[PDB]
């Protein structure tokens, strides 16, 4: 919007950027009761008229000027006995368009969510296409690899002006100072034009028609301090007067939204399995290798020389992804856990088209609930009408803060909620010694109703199984048959154990609290849920550990499950636990492999899920089409 004031005293000169509203003030300097307007053919005057200020006179230019002032407007002021007094206006039209991929396919200054929304996407440039380097690509002020440009978002400035136009005008590209630390912009002929402590740049643009390409990288994920929006603006300046400051004639802009870090549920098809089972195990590792092949997965394995005896590949990292219309790449969220695997995500996982993030304090100030077996996501889910098409992040907490309670660090929680497309849900896991949601829940795919089952550990179910076995004559059957060094225990004495039953009633109650919580927060019905027979015991601080290998802590590789071998009571040549589980899951077309993790994992307080990790295929559904 511009108001040009015209004057019989003086001719007026003015620029008109196409796609802009220009109007005339014809009254303020008028000499005379009426006026007429006459303009050249490229000006459309939209509006023999009375000289009253309520008269809207609006000018539109059809196309760019070939020369300065090549369009013109004559305002004739005339009266009842006065010969006409004319006022002149000389116009110069220009095209100035800052473009970006605002329809989210392939190239209102407002970013809107949803299929009918608008606004271009920006990726955080958190991988490392630069060969033999340690740092992420967005850490320097240079484009060092041509393929790095694939991660960046294209923005273009198209101008169409007279050959002499930038004699007297200048263009400046800018970003707010509040945002300059979160973005870098490169000018393609690459050299940096905008970024940290570089909030504006004068552009060198020749007259006529020109097109200038820019490449934009984000430097920061959305977070509590950063909603995720970056605005870049082009300003046109009149630099005509040597005795005067520059004068803004026109501003236009593009708003980008930085892509959120997104997790993938056990229902997304697996692409790559990780273990760092180079340590004293080997048949464990053989078993996961067979599963990986059955599942058609790359297999990556971490040597004891790198592990540092840290076998818990689930816990230091979570492989998610970022996604823009032009580019999608996996991104490792590196837990601050910082144990033997500390170097693995930064040295072995991050790299070409493999992004990196971390959060939280890196030198301690951490808890077990920051290990990423405490970080999971549900399958897609619709809940009393609200749709969650990438699922809902699930993570474990206490039921209230006490001096004795634990939580995942606030920095991590805040980062996850600021990603806003998998709206996290706090679960209750602090009752477990280790403290992770992967100790009592899993999701697996299913061919029917909602496409998954929620699996939950279930003391109830194991008591039922064992009772049924004893009812049919097998109370002498031994739990822990098969084991080198273990006290065998008979079904009958397990059932008769009143303290064990007390402990497992308490655990049942903790698990049921989450059952109902997941029901509410995911819109699950009982028919979405399968109980896995599982016994627990309480130990130090009355905290819960698995009584026999925790079977819900499984590896889900499509229809192929890697389940800790419970070494349960052998009845008809078969562990009845294995039997029960198979009867529960095989009707969904899942294939159960029971992996001996006993001396290697189980007795160190984790199982098969805990010892492994999976990279899975990103959702087809584009995050930006959500309405969070």
């Amino acid at each position: 919007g511009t108001l040009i004031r015209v004057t019989p005293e003086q001719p007026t000169h003015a620029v008109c950027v196409l796609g802009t509203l220009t109007q005339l003030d014809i009254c303020s300097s008028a000499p005379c009761t009426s006026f007429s307007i006459n303009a050249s053919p490229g000006v459309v005057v939209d509006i023999t008229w009375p000289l009253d200020p309520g008269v809207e006179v609006t000018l539109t230019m059809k196309a760019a000027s070939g020369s300065t002032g090549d369009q013109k407007v004559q305002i004739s002021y005339y009266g009842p006995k006065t010969p006409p007094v004319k006022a002149l206006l000389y116009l110069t039209a220009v095209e100035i368009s800052l473009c970006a991929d605002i329809t989210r396919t392939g190239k209102q200054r407002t970013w809107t969510w949803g299929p009918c929304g608008q606004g271009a996407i920006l990726l955080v440039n958190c991988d490392r296409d630069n060969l033999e380097s340690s740092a992420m690509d967005c850490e320097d002020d240079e484009v060092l690899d041509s393929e790095d440009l694939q991660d960046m978002s294209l923005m273009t400035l198209s101008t169409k002006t007279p050959k002499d136009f930038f004699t007297n005008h200048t263009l400046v590209l800018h970003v707010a100072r509040s945002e300059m630390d979160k973005v870098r912009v490169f000018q393609a002929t690459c050299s940096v034009v905008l970024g940290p402590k570089w909030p504006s740049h004068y552009l060198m643009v020749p007259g006529g028609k020109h097109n200038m390409d820019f490449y934009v990288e984000a430097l920061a994920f959305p977070d509590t301090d950063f909603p995720g929006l970056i605005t870049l603006t082009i300003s046109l300046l009149d630099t005509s007067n040597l005795e005067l400051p520059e004068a803004v004639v026109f501003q236009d802009s593009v708003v980008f939204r930085v892509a959120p870090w997104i997790m993938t549920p056990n229902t997304q098809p697996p692409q790559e399995v990780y273990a760092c089972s180079i340590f004293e195990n080997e048949d464990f590792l053989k078993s996961v290798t067979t599963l990986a092949m059955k599942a058609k997965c790359k297999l990556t394995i971490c040597p004891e020389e790198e592990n540092m005896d840290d076998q818990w590949m689930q816990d230091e990292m979570e492989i998610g992804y970022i996604q823009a219309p032009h580019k999608t790449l996996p991104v490792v969220f590196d837990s601050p856990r910082n144990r033997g695997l500390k170097e693995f995500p930064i040295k072995r996982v991050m790299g070409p088209d493999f992004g990196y993030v971390t959060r939280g304090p890196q030198t301690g100030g951490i808890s077990g609930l920051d290990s990423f077996g405490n970080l999971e996501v549900s399958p897609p889910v619709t809940v009393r009408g609200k749709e969650y098409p990438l699922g809902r992040i699930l993570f474990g907490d206490s039921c209230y803060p006490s001096n004795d309670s634990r939580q995942m660090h606030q920095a991590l929680q805040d980062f996850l909620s600021a990603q806003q497309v998998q709206a996290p849900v706090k679960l209750y896991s602090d009752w477990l010694s280790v403290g992770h949601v992967d100790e009592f829940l899993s999701f697996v795919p299913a061919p029917d109703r909602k496409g998954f089952r929620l699996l939950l550990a279930s003391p109830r179910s194991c008591y039922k199984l064992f009772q049924e076995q004893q009812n049919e004559g097998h109370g002498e059957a031994l739990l822990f048959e098969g084991i080198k060094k273990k006290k065998q225990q008979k079904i009958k004495n397990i059932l008769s154990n009143k303290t064990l039953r007390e402990h497992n009633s308490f655990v049942e109650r903790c698990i049921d609290w989450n059952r109902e919580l997941l029901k509410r927060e995911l819109g699950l019905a009982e028919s979405d849920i399968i109980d896995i027979p599982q016994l627990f015991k309480l130990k130090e601080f009355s905290k819960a550990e698995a009584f026999f290998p925790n079977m819900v802590n499984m590896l889900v590789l499509g229809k192929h499950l890697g389940i800790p071998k419970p070494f349960g009571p052998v009845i008809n040549g078969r562990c009845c636990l294995e039997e029960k589980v198979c009867s529960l899951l095989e009707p969904l077309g899942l294939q159960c492999t029971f992996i001996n993790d006993f001396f290697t994992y189980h007795i160190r307080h984790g199982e098969v899920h805990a010892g492994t990790n999976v990279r899975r295929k990103p959702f087809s559904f584009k995050w930006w089409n959500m309405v969070p």
């Binding site: 816990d315 144990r339 077990g368 307080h605 805990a610």
Partner: peptide, 5 residues
């Protein structure tokens, strides 16, 4: 290594 600690 103990998972928890």
């Amino acid at each position: 290594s103990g998972r928890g600690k």
